[PDB]
Amino acid sequence: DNMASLIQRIARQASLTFREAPMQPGFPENLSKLKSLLTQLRAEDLNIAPRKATLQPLPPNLPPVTYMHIYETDGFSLGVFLLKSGTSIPLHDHPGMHGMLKVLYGTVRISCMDKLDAGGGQRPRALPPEQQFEPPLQPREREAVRPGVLRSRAEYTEASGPCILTPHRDNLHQIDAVEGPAAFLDILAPPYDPDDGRDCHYYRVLEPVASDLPREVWLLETPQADDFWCEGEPYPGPKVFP
Ligand SMILES: [Fe+3]
C-alpha cells in the first residue's frame, strides 16, 4: 500500500479527466471515476476541522466566504470555499465549464438553474411588455432579461454525493449555508479567466406580480453584490505535487 493522499489522487484524476495500447479511459469514464474519488473526501482528509457558528453579526470588514487554493492547471482549478453562518454564494454561472463540488462540513442549500438555450431545443422568449416586477425594471434592464428554469433546490451535506454541473445543465447555482457554517471542495474546468473572457456572472431571479420545481423564471444579470466577496486563507491539507 503505497497510496498518495486522497487530494493528490483527486488532482491527478481531474488532470486526466479535463486535460494507445491498451486504450485508456475516455471522458465519461474519467468523470465517473473523479466523482467516485470525490465521494470519499472528508474534511479531515484536508486537515480542515468543522467550524461552528459565530454569534456576532458579520460586519462589512469581514468576508462572508473564504477560499483555500489547492491546485490549478489550465485544465482545472481545485479549491475549498468556506461559508460563514447565514451567508451565501449568490446566484452565478460557469460559462462553458464543467464543475463538481463536495460538501466537507455543514449543510448547504444549492439552487440549480439554467438559462433557456435554443441549442437545447428550447425557444427562449423575449420579456413581454405587459408583465412587471417588484421592484420595477428600468427599460434597458427589460431588454436584458433572459428566460431560465429553476430546476432544483435541495440541501446537501458531507454525506450527499457530489453535485455536478455541465456547460448546459445546472450551469447556474446559488449556495446558501444552512443553520451554520459550511464548506465545500469545488472543481471547475476550465478555470475561470476574467482576463480572457470567461467570467463568473451573477444573476437575480425576478419577482413578478405554485412553488413546484422545475418552473420557468426570468433572470437578470447583475454586478457582484456590494457585500459579497471571498478572500483567501491558508490551505492546511496535504500538498498537491508538484
Ligand atoms: Fe459555482
Question: Which three-class secondary structure string do you get for the chain?
Answer: CCCCCHHHHHHHHHHHHHCCCCCCCCHHHHHHHHHHHHHCCCHHHHCCCCCCCCCCCCCCCCCCEEEEEEEECCCCEEEEEEECCCCEEEEECCCCCEEEEEEEECEEEEEEEEECCHHHCCCCCCCCCCCCECCCCCHHHHHHCEEEEEEEEEEEECCCCCEEEECCECCEEEEEECCCCEEEEEEEECCCEHHHCECCCEEEECCECCCCCCEEEEEEEECCCCCCCEEECCCCCCCCCC
Is 119 inside a domain boundary? yes
Q: Is residue 241 part of a domain?
A: no
C-alpha of residue 242 to centroid of ligand 1, in Å: 26
The CA 78 to ligand 1 mean position distance, Å, reads 12
Q: Which of 154, 182, 184, 161 is nearest to 40 (CA)?
A: 161
Expressed in angstroms and rounded, the spacing between residue 94 Cα and the centre of ligand 1 is 7
Using an 8 Å Cβ cutoff, are 124 and 146 in contact?
yes
Sign for the CA dihedral angle at 2, 241, 35, 231 comes to positive
Q: Is residue 57 part of a domain?
A: no
242 located within any domain: no
* Cα–ligand 1 centroid distance for 165 (angstroms): 9
Q: Would residue 210 count as lying in a domain?
A: yes
91 phi, psi to nearest 5 deg: -55, 130
Range of the domain at 107: 6-52+62-232
Q: Which three cell numbers stand for residue 202?
A: 451573477
Residues in contact with 168: Cβ distance below 8 Å, sequence separation at least 6, in sequence order? 114, 117, 119, 120
Q: In angstroms, how far is CA 155 from the centroid of its own chain?
A: 14
Resolution of the coordinates, Å: 2.0
Q: Which method, experimentally, gave rise to this model?
A: X-ray
**How far apart, in whole angstroms, are the C-alpha atoms of residue 206 and residue 131?**
11
- Provide the domain count of the chain: 1
Q: Which three cell numbers stand for residue 1?
A: 500500500
Domain assignment present for 123? yes
Contact assessment for residue 167 and residue 96, using Cβ atoms and an 8 Å cutoff: yes
The type of residue at 61 is N
Q: How far is the CA of 140 from the centre of ligand 1 (A)?
A: 27
> Which is nearest to 91 in space by CA: 183, 204, 177?
204
Q: 92 labelled as ligand-binding?
A: yes
Asked whether residue 173 is marked as a ligand-binding residue, the answer is yes
The residues pairing with 156 across neighbouring beta strands, listed in sequence order, are 108
Residue 1 covered by a domain: no
Number of C-beta neighbours around residue 103 at 10 A: 24
98 marked among binding-site residues: no
Q: Is residue 217 in a domain?
A: yes
Nearest to 157 by CA among 174, 178, 172, 171: 178
Give the HSE-up count for residue 209: Cα atoms under 13 Å, Cβ half-sphere.
Answer: 7
Strand order in the sheet with 182-189: 163-165, 98-105, 182-189, 77-83, 65-72, 230-232
CATH code for position 214: 2.60.120.10
